Amino acid sequence: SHTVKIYDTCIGCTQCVRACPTDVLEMVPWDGCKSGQIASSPRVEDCVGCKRCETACPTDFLSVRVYLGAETTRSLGLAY
Amino acid sequence: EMSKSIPFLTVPEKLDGSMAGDVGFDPMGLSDIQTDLNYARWAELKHGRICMLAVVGMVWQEYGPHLPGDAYATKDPWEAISSVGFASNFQTLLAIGVVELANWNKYYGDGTPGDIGWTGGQLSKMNDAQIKTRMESEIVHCRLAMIAFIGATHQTFLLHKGLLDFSY
């Protein structure tokens, strides 16, 4: 459904993965930052488009960007 | 390279002598933008064939035996339309329409331009060359008729005199 992309400016603060309401983001090993960790979006099929993740990023400009797109039952948050 | 008809101009590429009546005449270059000259050839033939009949008819109606009955006597070719009436004209129009719509695919297709099957027994038992000769004759006559139609009509409305009236 929606598209979430992570950029090299990430600092591995883990704040984004701790804010997702649907477990779409994970922290994976990396060497480009001091923390030695980067964020990934393995399960974008469950993204609802809340953008809470973006609100949590501390980088000058979001290192995590959510681009809204095709809509499915899951993305539209339909319990019915 | 140089047109045969106009010796001081370059001949357009599509005019290669393949089709009948190709004297290399296309000064304004209307052949380049067209994918092929098939549709144009259909039109040339259709326009010419109609004009042939028209010129003959005009002369006959002015100087010839009319059909029995009033309203079918006016010699003036233009007045004839109104005189004869809507009914007569409509019936002809509908007939022409049927033929036109029936051969629609032919007109917009890739067959021999101008051939709708009304070849009589002619154009048969003859070699390709002879066939081309016949086709060339038709196109020449078509072009002549079209020029004549313009002249006849213009003379009628400008000089206001019968076609065969030659007075100076």
Partner: protein, 732 residues
Amino acid sequence: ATKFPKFSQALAQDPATRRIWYGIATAHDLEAHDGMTEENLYQKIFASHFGHLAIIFLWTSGNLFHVAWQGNFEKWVSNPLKTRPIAHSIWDPHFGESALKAFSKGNTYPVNITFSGLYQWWYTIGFRTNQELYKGSIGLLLLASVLLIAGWLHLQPKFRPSLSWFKNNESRLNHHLSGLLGFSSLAWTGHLVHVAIPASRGVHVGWDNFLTTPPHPAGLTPFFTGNWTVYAENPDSATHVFNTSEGSGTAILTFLGGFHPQTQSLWLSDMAHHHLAIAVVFIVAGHMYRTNFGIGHNMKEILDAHRPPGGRLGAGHVGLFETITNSLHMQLGLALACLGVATSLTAQHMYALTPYAYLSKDFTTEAALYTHHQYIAGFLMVGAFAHGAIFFVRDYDPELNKNNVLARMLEHKEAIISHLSWASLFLGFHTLGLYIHNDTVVAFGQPEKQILFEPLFAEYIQAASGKAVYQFNVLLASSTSPATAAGNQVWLPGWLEAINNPKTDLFLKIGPGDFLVHHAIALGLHVTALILVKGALDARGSKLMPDKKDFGYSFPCDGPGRGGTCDISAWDAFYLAMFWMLNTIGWVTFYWHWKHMTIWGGNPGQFDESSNYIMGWLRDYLWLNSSPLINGYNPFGMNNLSVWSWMFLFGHLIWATGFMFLISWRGYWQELIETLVWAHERTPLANLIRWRDKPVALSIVQARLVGLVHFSVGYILTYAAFVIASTSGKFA
């Protein structure tokens, strides 16, 4: 796709009702459809244009047909100033007997009176009988069919035009300027000389005798001999009665200037000369570009060479040629802008220089036409800026336009926006302030303390063209001026008569009241522009969203973070500007109507004194002139203004309904819809029936659009009723 939006898999695979809503509103954005090549795009657009043309012709055909079959054109022709023009008949099964009588007043059957001005136009151009109108309608129906055939033909495989053909600018411009505009004008002067002018003088020239009825006694001899002056001799006398030979002349091309004394409209001979001159100008201009004949200009070269040597404009216009040719949005924007200016000009010049006979005496029609074109102009203007923004987001190439005149505009964007803001503030504070000062002092009973500035600059311009009331002895208002001497024997005689006649709309008299309203209109234009311009410049990015270009022209928002990013897309600028556009056009239209209303009523003073403060507008204009409308239907009966009365209230409803979508947002509604779903699934009997498209609330942008449409439709409808019922109810 395999669902409704065949052009979009994304929408097609949507499990909700959005699939249907969006598919309808994304249908004509051919550029974004799945699998679209540039060649196909152009070809489909070309065909679509043929269809639009056909619709326009069918529309015109209908007007002629209905007027001819159910109208009173011939009677009107006989007594133009005592007959009300009929548009079409009415067959409503819901009408009551009383209504049938009311709407059938003056005639024998229920009918609608036209306020479109077609009768005057047709009368002027030569139409005199209903049979003539019929022929026209039939012809246009045929032309419409021909256009439809063309659309199909050029979508066929062997007739689809190439992408190169679509981008040959030189040939198209040459042809369009010389043939579409130039030769067409020449053809029109032919009609005017052959059919119209003869009719005005009582002679019938039709398809039956046009080839034998010479337009001028001399013939075409003077034309080829060079003695063109002959065609301007013997102009119609000042005692000429229109549509008759009494006092007629023989002139066909003249420069008399002014209006026909009896019809109070521009002379036909002058119009013929006008179109002839315009024709030559355009035909000559159409020979400027190179089109496979050697001679001509190449547009790219012209643009590239124009760079001011000083360097004040950077690299100049280099790079713009490719940008325009490869962007349909910029082309559309340029077109809409120019057409918008044209529409406003038509409205402004048509009420002053009346072109059609007895149109000035039809107050309601005159009012409708002005408001009609001015509103259309506003929409056309806003669209231009909208497509300009779409261009920046979609088709702008930063590299191609390096240091170009266009790029440098986006470099000082802040300067432009900030200064436009200041202008808006200055105009706003003082205009409102002065109005309120005048209101307060008047309310306290001291009108002598009002701040009223005379519009001296405008008054000067009027005087410069000949007006004498202001007493500014300048230019054409001066007998000793070199200018007066020049045209005193050419066109001034007639002009100086009309400009100095109080019963004409040529340069109406202005006073302190006009000063203020003009400054209000200025505020509107500036503020509307600010919104639109900002949207365009800040469409590719901003400090809040430096990556806006990657999201598009229209997106809901960017989240509740970074402070909140609602209405941050460029589409939202269009959304916000629409409201201001309506407001400004409203002010403009109100001004025209009230001023004219008082003039027509014979009390120009009311506007002159009450227009200085706001209460005047509300009480002496909106309140006073609403009495006929609100009494279309009352507890005691009804009249022909009932339909207009009902529509007025209808408009208010739609307008207010719009507010719901504008103020209430999605969250609330979505939750409510969820409850309704539960109910349907749990209620016996109805459970049998179920939906195939999950019911969901309207989207953020969708609601904005729906709301704007409701607001707009109500706005236009309500005023339409007022302008018509008020004018007709009082003066008709």
